[PDB]
Every structure is written in C-alpha cells, then in structure tokens.
Write a protein that binds this ligand. Structure first.
Ligand SMILES: Nc1nc2c(ncn2[C@@H]2O[C@H](CO)[C@H]3O[P@](O)(=S)O[C@H]32)c(=O)[nH]1
Ligand SMILES: [Ca+2]
Length: 104
C-alpha cells in the first residue's frame, strides 16, 4: 500500500524522507538545482491546512525513485519547512493548470 498516492504515483515514507533530506540539504547550503530553482519557496496559495509552520519549501519527488538533480521535475513535490518538518506531499495531477492538490 502507498503512504502517499499522487495520481498514479505511489510513494512510501522512505521515498518522502529521502527526497526531503536532499531538498533540505540544498536549502541549508543556499544552493539550487534545475531551471526552476529547487528547492524554492512554496507560498501555499492553495491554502492547505498544514500542521507545521511556514515558511514552506517545495522539492520534487520522482516516481523513478531517484533524487531530483535537474531536468523535468514531474508533477509531484514534497513540502517541508525551516525545521525540516514535513508539511505534506502535493501534486499537479488532477489539479487545474499549475495548481496543486494533496496526495492522498
Ligand atoms: N500553485 C502554486 N504554485 C506555487 C506556489 N508557491 C510557489 N509556486 C510556484 O509557482 C509556479 C507556478 O504554479 C509553480 O511551478 P512549481 O515549479 S511546481 O513551483 C510553483 C503556491 O502556493 N501554489
Ligand atoms: Ca519507492
């Protein structure tokens, strides 16, 4: 069973922890990867009811199992805060345009 289901993509807690650690590391060092500069600030225009405090940062999580290192980020993202606390897992899949919906 999936801990997080983003459309057709299935993730475990390990997948999420691995992705988050990478993105948080880059955030801490003040570095970015990709043409869209990840990780970067996630404003939460959607207004998700996250259990942890802002600021939030988004980092791509890949269905391939690899850690994002550039190129197409896919539709899925892990959102974490300043304290490396997981806020949630969101996706563009099933959402209009560039909006997001939570992964169930
Ligand atoms: N939909 C959405 N995009 C945001 C938000 N904060 C920052 N963005 C960035 O704005 C871009 C347009 O939606 C998005 O491409 P993305 O790379 S997944 O990073 C997203 C937010 O709260 N909602
Ligand atoms: Ca996996």
């Amino acid at each position: 069973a999936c801990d997080y289901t983003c459309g057709s993509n299935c993730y475990s807690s390990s997948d999420v922890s691995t992705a988050q650690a990478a993105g948080y590391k880059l955030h801490e060092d003040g570095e970015t990867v990709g043409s869209n500069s990840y990780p970067h600030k996630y404003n939460n225009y959607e207004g998700f009811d996250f259990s942890v405090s802002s600021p939030y940062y988004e980092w791509p999580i890949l269905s391939s199992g690899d850690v994002y290192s550039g190129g197409s980020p896919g539709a899925d993202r892990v959102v974490f805060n300043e304290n490396n606390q997981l806020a949630g897992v969101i996706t563009h899949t099933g959402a209009s345009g560039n909006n997001f919906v939570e992964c169930t």
